[PDB]
């Protein structure tokens, strides 16, 4: 009987009523479409912004599509947020997380560049990481196509995107971009392997992200358990940038985020650890279906402003 907010519980009851196929039982196109449909009906609508612009940058496999969000048509040099969507490195795209990106841009009053990285199974590990790193370095170089100079970058992302956040920050720590990572915001990230964790057993079914979906994602992505680009808990934390780790109390991978924040404290790094009570994985993208999660996102925003000083 873990604590669940009433609005969260109602959403979980509707998902249970829907029932229907697992990700693995669908075709890939169907699986991706169902995620579009879920966030389409569950999230608050897009904020209006001065700038919402599609562009691209070079990557190791070809061009990487990007989307720029900015509440300001013109702005001075400052930190730029570099966002990586979740979806197990298999599903999700620029549209599944579009509304959340507009919200981050609106509430932070900073530019946001979302990365349309290559997906598994067609592009297995480390394709997503390669693209997220390359796009983040490109933004950090203040290209003229972007139209706003970066004094630093802020990697942020949910779930798989929170995994990518941590990996990108480690890769740029080892080999700096043109400006530093000034803050990283992994939201319900995968840092340590969730297999064997207490949270995975406790929340394996009925809490939006399922153990079955995790296994489907594992099989598609094929990240080696010994590779720190797959499981960044294995990385060097001694120079980790300022960090905000946000988890959900009902998340099967909650303990992975607990592990990562503990590792940062162990290494003497500054970290804000926020564990949202009574909500699930995906809370950043279900802000209309579960209205209390808007407040959870706003707490992350407040922590970001504080850590940026
Ligand atoms: O990856 N996820 O966050 C998911 C995946 C499938 C789903 O039905 C809900 C959430
Ligand atoms: O999409 N996810 O959050 C995942 C995917 C795979 C995994 O092993 C753990 C978490
Ligand atoms: O979604 N993820 O973050 C993942 C997915 C697969 C994996 O092996 C490791 C992490
Ligand atoms: C929009 C998601 C596609 C990114 C490139 C890929 O399919 O692998
Ligand atoms: C093991 C999952 C139940 C959550 C109990 C805790 O907060 O540690």
Give a verbal description of the structure.
With 309 residues, the protein is α/β, with parallel strands linked by helices. The protein has one domain (1-309). Helices cover 37% and strands 17% of the residues. The protein is built from nine helices and eight strands. The strands form two sheets. Strands 1-2-4-3-5-6 form a six-stranded mixed sheet. A two-stranded parallel sheet has the order 7-8. Helix 5 (160-174) links the parallel strand 5 (150-158) and strand 6. The chain binds P-nitrophenol (3 copies) and hexanoic acid (6NA) (2 copies). The site of one P-nitrophenol has 9 residues, from helix 7. Residues 88-89, 159-160, 163, 190, 217-218, 221, 223, 230 line the site of one P-nitrophenol.
Comma- or semicolon-separated keywords:
globular, GDXG_lipolytic_enzyme, two-stranded parallel sheet, binds P-nitrophenol, 8 strands, binds hexanoic acid, 309 residues, 9 helices, monomer, six-stranded mixed sheet, alpha/beta
Order of strands, widest sheet:
1-2-4-3-5-6
- Binned, the helix content reads 25-40%
The largest sheet, given as strand count, sense and whether it forms a barrel, is: 6 strands, mixed
- The share of residues in extended strands comes to 15-25%
Question: What letter string, H or E per element, gives the SSE order?
Answer: HHEEEHEHEHEHHEHEH
């Amino acid at each position: 009987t873990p604590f669940i907010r009433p609005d969260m519980k109602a959403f979980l009851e509707a998902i249970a009523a829907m029932a229907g196929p697992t990700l693995a039982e669908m075709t890939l196109e169907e699986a991706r479409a169902s995620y579009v449909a879920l966030h389409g009906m569950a999230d608050r609508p897009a904020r209006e912004l001065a700038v919402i612009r599609n562009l691209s940058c070079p990557g190791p496999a070809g061009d990487i599509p990007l989307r720029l969000y900015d509440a300001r048509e013109s702005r001075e040099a400052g930190p730029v947020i570099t966002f990586y969507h979740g979806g197990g490195f298999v599903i999700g795209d620029l549209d599944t997380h579009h509304n959340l990106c507009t919200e981050i841009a609106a509430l932070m009053d900073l530019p946001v560049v979302a990365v349309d990285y290559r997906l598994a199974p067609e592009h297995p590990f480390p394709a997503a990481i390669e693209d997220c790193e390359a796009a983040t370095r490109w933004v950090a170089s203040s290209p003229s196509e972007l139209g706003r100079t970066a004094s630093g970058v802020i990697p942020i992302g949910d779930a798989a995107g929170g995994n990518a956040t941590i990996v990108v920050s480690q890769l740029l720590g080892a080999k700096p971009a043109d400006v530093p990572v000034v803050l990283q915001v992994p939201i319900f990230p995968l840092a340590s392997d969730a297999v064997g964790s207490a949270s995975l057993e406790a929340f394996a079914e009925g809490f939006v992200l399922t153990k079955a979906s995790i296994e489907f994602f594992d099989t598609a992505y094929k990240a080696d358990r010994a590779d720190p680009r797959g499981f960044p808990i294995l990385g060097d934390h001694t120079a980790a940038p300022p960090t905000i780790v946000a988890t959900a109390s009902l998340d099967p991978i909650r303990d992975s985020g607990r592990d990562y924040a503990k590792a940062l404290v162990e290494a003497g790094r500054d970290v804000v650890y926020l564990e949202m009570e009574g909500v699930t994985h995906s809370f950043t993208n279900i802000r209309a279906a579960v209205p209390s999660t808007q407040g959870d996102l706003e707490r992350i925003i407040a922590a970001m402003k504080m850590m940026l000083g």
